[PDB]
Design a protein around this ligand. Structure first.
Ligand SMILES: C#Cc1cn([C@@H]2O[C@H](CO)[C@@H](O)[C@@H]2F)c(=O)[nH]c1=O
Ligand SMILES: C#Cc1cn([C@@H]2O[C@H](CO)[C@@H](O)[C@@H]2F)c(=O)[nH]c1=O
Lengths: 313, 306
């Protein structure tokens, strides 16, 4: 069978993810590699009207005390649903074509973000910003699609000071450093969570230890430095002080989805050509998969180009 | 060979009798997974059912916009579906291939598609959810595992009105339009499964909407000839067409069984038992899967059942 390499570039906004992705794709001959962009057109038009603008405006009205947490939550939850839809459909239509983990790839697919960005990371950050309930975050977690083989996720490293400057320059967006801190924190926790699970970590065994860096290598993190720490909140706790079982089961799903992921860390604290070449070096250690039919390769190619055409800027 | 499992999802429009009939149907090699009322009223959010019906009522009276109602309905639907989604996700790895004596029978009050497809679709028909949000929920419907037996109800409308009148849940308001919308959706659901199983292809038949199996106009696909979903030239945007491809994938491998509710509670129970002989069983994946499934089921029941 021919092989496929899927690479999801993810992490907080404003790091240079999208530029880096385009540069890497520009290296390949036209169809040895395809780009799957942020579905900006879906967010701004097809899915709803100006969803990004809606998100930042809602947070700002919450902060200013012009709306309640509950009103902010229903708007945020509904908008996060819209944000994630194209990621969910894409994953769903790709799924049957993906075979077992497997000599250059017949096809390389570079994604701008994985489904977990809209289904986990952004909701979790909004929870920290007080604009989503943790119960709602856990409903999104429960709906994270089964993690396909050869799911290579590239997350970003970048000093906060540089990141802030970068954001202050390079939508419907408003400048919110608090949200930036939360989303940086959330993606840091995510990297640690995958590494914790790969090192044999069991959240149920470590839950009692709760009371309040790079990845795919290094020692096992403390549970308090993983995403599990966010979910010890009064809303989720039964009178006896344990998590309600329904929420505990959502954490089980979280562990199952993240544990089979292949995380790599890319240093964004450099020029665009630098990030590209750094990303190119990283791909050597990334996991390829087989496809399930011979004509899966052109089918996948067409899906990606159709998607890009319809929804990328 | 691993022991066998029978999963039975009792679904369909609410207020037909689904929660009493199965209450009767139970007691060791059979577990009843009741509707997660406690999650709906307390754990997930405060009185989600009241929230839903109040919002539709306010929209009807023109006290809020279509827009305000949709964001409210959308997030509320997220809360409604959550226990159904976690349960499916934690059960999924335990489910083996198709497979006689079942080691364990799981009777669920509703399948994930109630909250991820049918109720959202009905609210779309009620003007209180956008069709793009409906297709977002559809895109997240978990893959259809082997042995997915879904029981849907049959009941004439007037009899259903009578039943519903006595089966109002906390916060529910009696709404004949919602009753009609939800009955229509489940009727379309049954048709859609049959359309798909008999080889229907929505992309091939899509042209027929704009003028041996059901006509596409009598399936769930007809709902998504919504103008929000269409480019200026009338074509579905691909992203929406893909959600329809997913909808088709999910439904065609479901096994649908019809339970006539127009009879006594014990008659309904007997009818459900009669239906089981056609249902498809699966093996589990590990020896300990059965006890684990049993624990999940009983814990769900205890913590979230009313
Ligand atoms: C995917 C994604 C998401 C992107 N975003 C935002 O979209 C913008 C562009 O990525 C940026 O301001 C931020 F990343 C969300 O607020 N939520 C999401 O789920
Ligand atoms: C599952 C489920 C759902 C149930 N409901 C409602 O909850 C009650 C189910 O017993 C009933 O009033 C109605 F069916 C929804 O409004 N949406 C759903 O998704």
């Amino acid at each position: 069978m021919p092989t496929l390499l899927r690479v999801y570039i993810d992490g907080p906004h404003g790091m240079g993810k999208t530029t880096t992705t385009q540069l890497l794709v520009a290296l390949g001959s036209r169809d040895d590699i395809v780009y799957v962009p942020e579905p900006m057109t879906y967010w701004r038009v097809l899915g709803a009207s100006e969803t990004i603008a809606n998100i930042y405006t809602t947070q700002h009205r919450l902060d200013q005390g012009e709306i309640s947490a509950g009103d902010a939550a229903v708007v945020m939850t509904s908008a996060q649903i819209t944000m994630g839809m194209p990621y969910a459909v894409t994953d769903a239509v790709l799924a049957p074509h993906i075979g077992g983990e497997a000599p250059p790839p017949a096809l390389t697919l570079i994604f701008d973000r994985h489904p977990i960005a809209a289904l986990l990371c952004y909701p979790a950050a909004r929870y920290l910003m007080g604009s989503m309930t943790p119960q709602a975050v856990l409903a999104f977690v429960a709906l994270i699609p089964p993690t396909l083989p050869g799911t290579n996720i590239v997350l970003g490293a970048l000093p906060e000071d540089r990141h802030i400057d970068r954001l202050a320059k390079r939508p419907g967006e408003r400048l919110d450093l608090a949200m930036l801190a939360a989303i940086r924190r959330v993606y840091g926790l995510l990297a640690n969570t995958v590494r914790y699970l790969q090192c044999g970590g069991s959240w149920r065994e470590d839950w009692g230890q709760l009371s309040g860096p790079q990845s795919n290598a290094g020692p096992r993190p403390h549970i308090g430095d993983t995403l599990f720490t966010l979910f010890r909140a009064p809303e989720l706790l039964a009178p006896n002080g344990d998590l309600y079982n329904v929420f505990a089961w959502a954490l089980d799903v979280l562990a199952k989805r993240l544990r089979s992921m292949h995380v790599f860390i890319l240093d964004y604290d450099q020029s665009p050509a630098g990030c590209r070449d750094a990303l190119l070096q990283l791909t050597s250690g990334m996991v390829q998969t087989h496809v399930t039919t011979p004509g899966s390769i052109p089918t996948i190619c067409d899906l990606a180009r159709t998607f890009a055409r319809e929804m990328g800027e």
